Amino acid sequence: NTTGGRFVDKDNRKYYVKDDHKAIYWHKIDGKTYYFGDIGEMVVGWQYLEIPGTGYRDNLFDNQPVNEIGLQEKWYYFGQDGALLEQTDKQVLEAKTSENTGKVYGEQYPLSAEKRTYYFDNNYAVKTGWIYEDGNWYYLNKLGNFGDDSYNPLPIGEVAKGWTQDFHVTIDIDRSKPAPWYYLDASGKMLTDWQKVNGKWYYFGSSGSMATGWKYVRGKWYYLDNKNGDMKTGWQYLGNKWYYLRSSGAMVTGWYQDGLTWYYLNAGNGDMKTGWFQVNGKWYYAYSSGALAVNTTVDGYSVNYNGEWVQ
């Protein structure tokens, strides 16, 4: 807690001077918190700053050495008086834009008439990640917009919409950890179970993560694209074996007739069978294409209209 000082207005800026030295970075002054930057100019409004509390950026004055430290940056909101908004739940505030962030006391900037509901963590920074609100899950952006060299932290903390990947993020993305896919609706609601997006079907389960590969959902087997997740139908060559999935996407087992041709999908895994196989005591022969032989001979041996072997 900083004491023995005084706020001073000068040069269309504001400072906190004690013993004739300017205050810098974070300071607790009389039950309130302020951030005076690198040269002492008090900040107002939306600010993207290193997290306070470590002491490496706290209770410092312009006459002391500033230490090298690797601290994560986060969004904070200060009032027009310079006092930090110590909110830990939610609050409606002016939207974060390209022209109301990083301003100092004295600097006049347009007030965004657009107001948004921002959420805060227990340390007064804008919350990121998942949040539950009225029986639904929303995702607040963990990362800004990336570029070849450009990074815009402005979207951090905003309600995500559409296809969104959830990364493990501290200061940078952790590419060693998984990053599932989610879809937030036109109001940010996380989608669950089966959903049709852009004409194709996707399964999000009960947790919301997009499914990939084979998935057993309510007694049926489905195949979601191994990478893009969209549901497959019809004949599919997966794992060097053949499978037929209905228009509903449900895998087919047993006998199936495509037009006039008969195929047999193995009972267990539904893989198409070839060559000689036996169903309920009787024998059948299926060509390389999986098509069943009917009313013909196979190596001299005869099969009737049902494909059954007739001694």
Ligand X SMILES: C[N+](C)(C)CCO
Q: Is there binding between residue 5 and ligand X (CB under 6 A)?
A: no
> What is the DSSP code string of the chain?
-B-S-EEEEETTEEEEEETTEEEESEEEBSS-EEE-TTTSPPB-EEEEEEPS-SSTTBSEETTSPPPP----EEEEEE-TTS-B---SSEEEEEPP-TTSBS-BTT------S-EEEEEB-TTSSBP-EEEE-SS-EEEE-SS-EE-SS-EE-TTTTSBP-EEEE---BSSSB-TTS---EEEE-TTSPBP-SEEEETTEEEE-TTT-PPP-EEEEETTEEEEE-TTT-PBP-EEEEETTEEEEE-TT--B--EEEEETTEEEEE-TTT-PBP-EEEEETTEEEEE-TTSPBP-SEEETTEEE-TTS-EE-
Segment contacting ligand X by CB under 6 A, of 1-9, 144-152, 153-161, 201-209: 201-209
Least CB distance from residue 22 to ligand X, whole Å?
Answer: 44
Site string for ligand X, 209-228 (x = CB under 6 A): -x---x------x------x
Q: Is there binding between residue 255 and ligand X (CB under 6 A)?
A: yes
Q: Which of 56, 163, 167, 277 touches ligand X (CB under 6 A)?
A: 163
Least CB distance from residue 15 to ligand X, whole Å?
Answer: 44
Q: Is there binding between residue 188 and ligand X (CB under 6 A)?
A: no
Q: Which of 7, 109, 167, 201 touches ligand X (CB under 6 A)?
A: 201
Q: Is there binding between residue 45 and ligand X (CB under 6 A)?
A: no
Number of residues in contact with ligand X under rule CB under 6 A: 30
Which residues of this protein are in contact with ligand X, per CB under 6 A? 130, 137, 163, 181, 190, 194, 201, 207-208, 210, 214, 221, 228-229, 231, 235, 242, 248-249, 251, 255, 258, 262, 269-270, 272, 289-290, 306-307
